[PDB]
Design a binder for this molecule. Sequence first.
Ligand code: ADP
Ligand code: MG
Length: 764
Amino acid sequence: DSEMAVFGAAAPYLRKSEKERLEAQTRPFDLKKDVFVPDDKQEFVKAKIVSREGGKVTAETEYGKTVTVKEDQVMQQNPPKFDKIEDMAMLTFLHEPAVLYNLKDRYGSWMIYTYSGLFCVTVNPYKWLPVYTPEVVAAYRGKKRSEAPPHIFSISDNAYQYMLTDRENQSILITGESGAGKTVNTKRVIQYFAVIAAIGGTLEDQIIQANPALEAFGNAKTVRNDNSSRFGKFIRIHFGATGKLASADIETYLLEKSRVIFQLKAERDYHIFYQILSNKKPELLDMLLITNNPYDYAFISQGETTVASIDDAEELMATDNAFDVLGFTSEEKNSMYKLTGAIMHFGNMKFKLKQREEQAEPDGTEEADKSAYLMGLNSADLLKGLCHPRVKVGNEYVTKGQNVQQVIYATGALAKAVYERMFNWMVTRINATLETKQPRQYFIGVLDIAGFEIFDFNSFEQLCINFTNEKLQQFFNHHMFVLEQEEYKKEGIEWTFIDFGMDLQACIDLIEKPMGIMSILEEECMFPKATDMTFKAKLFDNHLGKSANFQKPRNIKGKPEAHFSLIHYAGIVDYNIIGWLQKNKDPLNETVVGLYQKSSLKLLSTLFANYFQTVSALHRENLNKLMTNLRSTHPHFVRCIIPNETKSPGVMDNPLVMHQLRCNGVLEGIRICRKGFPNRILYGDFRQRYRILNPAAIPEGQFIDSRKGAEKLLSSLDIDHNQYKFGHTKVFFKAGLLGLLEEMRDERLSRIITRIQAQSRGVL
Ligand SMILES: Nc1ncnc2c1ncn2[C@@H]1O[C@H](COP(=O)(O)OP(=O)(O)O)[C@@H](O)[C@H]1O
Ligand SMILES: [Mg+2]
């Protein structure tokens, strides 16, 4: 296609063909008849009105079924010239099925990205597409969102152009459920900035390879997504004043550290454990005293060890190379396989009660002997200190007799803690390689928090993930719907505050505040006699009937026992409260940690060096640190939509996507663009950029007030004076009018350039 020639082989997946762009205007269409009507098994269906029956209406659906629906509920189709429109704000009719059927029609030819005014909607295709080839990065460079079709490269590029123009730090905030596409879209953003910087060192590649290193240790197969990324990641890319790639920093906010020892059915451990095994690689499995079968490792065997989607034998080589490119030295790279090897043995250690003494001692020794060799420990001191911890009580240490159940837990607590400290060290190792010391002024922070989750055993590790979602949407709701309406009244626009009905602070108050759920877990760590049944009672007495979002559990038949239900923004989640009081503090055996501090292995001695602050406190403070930082940046949202739970491509379930569109607030997010004034410019820059349009309206060199100058200027530009407004400090524009000025600006400049050529011929 001629216009699409710059996008190459990706062009059929970025615009409809030059045939269809014309042929769609030929479609049969009666505006009086083409409507959407509601239906139960599929949220809306296209229909033709058959008759009017006063305040009722009768219609024939697209599937030929007759329907009768009330006239306030039947709702017009968008007319066919708007089919597959690239920026849905410009629809003639905007409503629930309009955004639904437009997204289905773009997805119905695998055009996946779509704009929604100030943000984007990304449906997930479970099929790889050529739309990410590296020549398309060059085709996207420097274009406006009004020119090029919607794509993740366009949003990064628009964010980059805004950075250079307004001199303010950008953030790209990618949001959606588990399985929606947040990780790959983060990778594509990082891919764009890498390839741009590589056309114009090795930093450009290191920031690509910094992902698959972490994806080995931080991602694990769960039923919602085979590559579900169990940690929230915020990548700050740093750029110099010239705009070149300078450096990058990774932050990683929480890890599901209990997955190392506990897995549900249909789930894996972290990928590093299974790709060590599956490649059969003798350079590891002779250094680590492993045997090639996962099923005898008690930490790893439960759940599912293998999946059709992932070829671990190649993924191991990819991540072993990824540590090479990041510069991990060979002894250091081998060393972290040793701990990831030791953790497999560490769960196989058997312990037995002495028959009258009610104290546990090691049933065997060989699996402890393997672990102590890898961790660089004395096996005799390891098993002694594990079964006989010395706890300091002032002047004396008392020795506690561990029963067989609690010594098993103590191994689990140690295994978790080694893994989480090794992972968090690796991020600190990556950041130290990436700090290139190139000159710097601005940053672009790309965020993919762990997506909203509903498993069937919603333990504490899903409250922290679902609370993070509820804050980040409340960041979106604050930015798009409240701050966008505080600015209007502050600048004195003739505006009336609109109640969009999208606000969540009533539910965050149930979690974050000092008598919310995550505050009771901080009080009950102070009491030695607290227990989870007493904790659960303290919740109900404080919150049942004293908040709307806190409800009694709805135990369905089959589903495990659950102890309450929360009304989170995207669904009713039935948490299980067993064991949260240890999970919120998780204390280590102080003596065995003293052995890790005396390990010969330089890594493990570093991991526990300089080992009061709960898991929730450190989380909540870090999360409020994150969203303090984001408020000092201009956010670009990209919404991600999971179209199908079956993971089959192209088929879309209408109720499931409609639930996501509503709770992401996508419909309100477009309405504020059509109602409000999304583009706004300071009068100083308005004089500076746009006086070219009509220089005679305000002659520089003759003084005029910059406000009064703009007021004269726009009146002379033969444009509709209802589309713009004058505030105290800024001019404000309706949705399309900024584009109209840009088009008029380039047209006049081009004419001037032709006059420059013509005068040159004239003087010669
Ligand atoms: N843009 C895309 N192109 C092709 N396949 C995709 C895309 N996005 C998601 N998928 C499919 O869905 C899976 C989940 O994507 P993932 O990167 O794990 O996102 P998330 O971390 O949000 O679950 C991918 O492994 C792939 O199977
Ligand atoms: Mg992810």
